[PDB]
């Protein structure tokens, strides 16, 4: 029923084309991507347990041609395995192409391609920051609501080979056991406080001791000793998260116990940051591939 290869081919054929060229799928094609990916999200666990090797990517925010560059340099599925950490939509000009390609690859390679929820995969955020406006302009309001029902089923965290804990935002003062994540039921909205909110919204901070108020007005900051205690208690080596723009595309925290990944270079056309993805090989050797406009 879903002409999945046709969709992917049309999404990929604009690579190198006229700058900023749209790919306009049909609304039935997009509804099909949402419906079939939603089934797959709900059939897989909300806390993904993954094996290496894979490549991990941070925020994209609708920068569709940067997403295509990520695949060009990292390897198009299924040449490489992927975990994305969220924030696919808003701010950029091509949220629709971005999310449609990610959902298509999720359907095409369901056990080798993974998408986590970011704080922008939430209707009360992406109504404001661009995605709803893009849906209304290029399709209609009903399609935006279809996306929301799909996003409400995204998984929330991943653990790679029992050593790398991955989520969009960060730690939570309410996260004592991984079972608390596994117990979250879907579909769900993102609440204004609590575990699920923190996993999508919190940030590390070099200046806080323990837990502090987050400048965003949502959730918390956490310091380097919170990170160390969490890793020791759960026998983990690394937290891998996204959510903050960082100048070099990746940024270490607390003596390599945490890394922030951000995959949208020159974010909003306002910053002069690189994008990065992290390659994790079969032995959990971790390295960075850095994408930057030439200067």
């Amino acid at each position: 029923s879903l002409n999945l290869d046709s969709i992917i081919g049309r999404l990929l054929e604009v690579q190198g084309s006229r700058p900023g060229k749209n790919v306009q799928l049909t609304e039935n094609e997009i509804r099909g991507l949402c419906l079939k990916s939603r089934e797959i999200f709900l059939s897989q666990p909300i806390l993904l347990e993954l094996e290496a090797p894979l490549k991990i990517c941070g925020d994209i925010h609708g920068q569709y041609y940067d997403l295509l560059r990520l695949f060009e340099y990292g390897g198009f599925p299924p040449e490489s395995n992927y975990l994305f950490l969220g924030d696919y939509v808003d701010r950029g000009k091509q949220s629709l192409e971005t999310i449609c390609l990610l959902l298509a690859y999720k359907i095409k390679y369901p056990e080798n391609f993974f998408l986590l929820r970011g704080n922008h995969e939430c209707a009360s955020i992406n109504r404001i920051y661009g995605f709803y406006d893009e849906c209304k302009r290029r399709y209609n309001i009903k399609l935006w609501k279809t996306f929301t029902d799909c996003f409400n089923c995204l998984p929330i965290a991943a653990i790679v080979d029992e050593k790398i804990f991955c989520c969009h935002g960060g730690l939570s003062p309410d996260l004592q056991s991984m079972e608390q994540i596994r117990r979250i039921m879907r579909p769900t909205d993102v609440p204004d406080q609590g575990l699920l909110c923190d996993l999508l919204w919190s940030d590390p901070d070099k200046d806080v001791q323990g837990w502090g108020e987050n400048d965003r007005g949502v959730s918390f900051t956490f310091g380097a000793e919170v990170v160390a205690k969490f890793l020791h208690k759960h026998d983990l080596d690394l937290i891998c998260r996204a959510h903050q723009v960082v100048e070099d595309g990746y940024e270490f925290f607390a003596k390599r116990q945490l890394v922030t990944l951000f995959s949208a270079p020159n974010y909003c056309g306002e910053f002069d940051n690189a994008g990065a993805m992290m390659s994790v090989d079969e032995t959990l050797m971790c390295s960075f591939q850095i994408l930057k406009p030439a200067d």
Partner: peptide, 26 residues
Amino acid sequence: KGILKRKNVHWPEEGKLREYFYFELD
């Protein structure tokens, strides 16, 4: 060949940590 279900995270030498890709912006 799916990856959905004792190792240790480690890092390369400093010169092999980053691989750069440059692109022309329009």
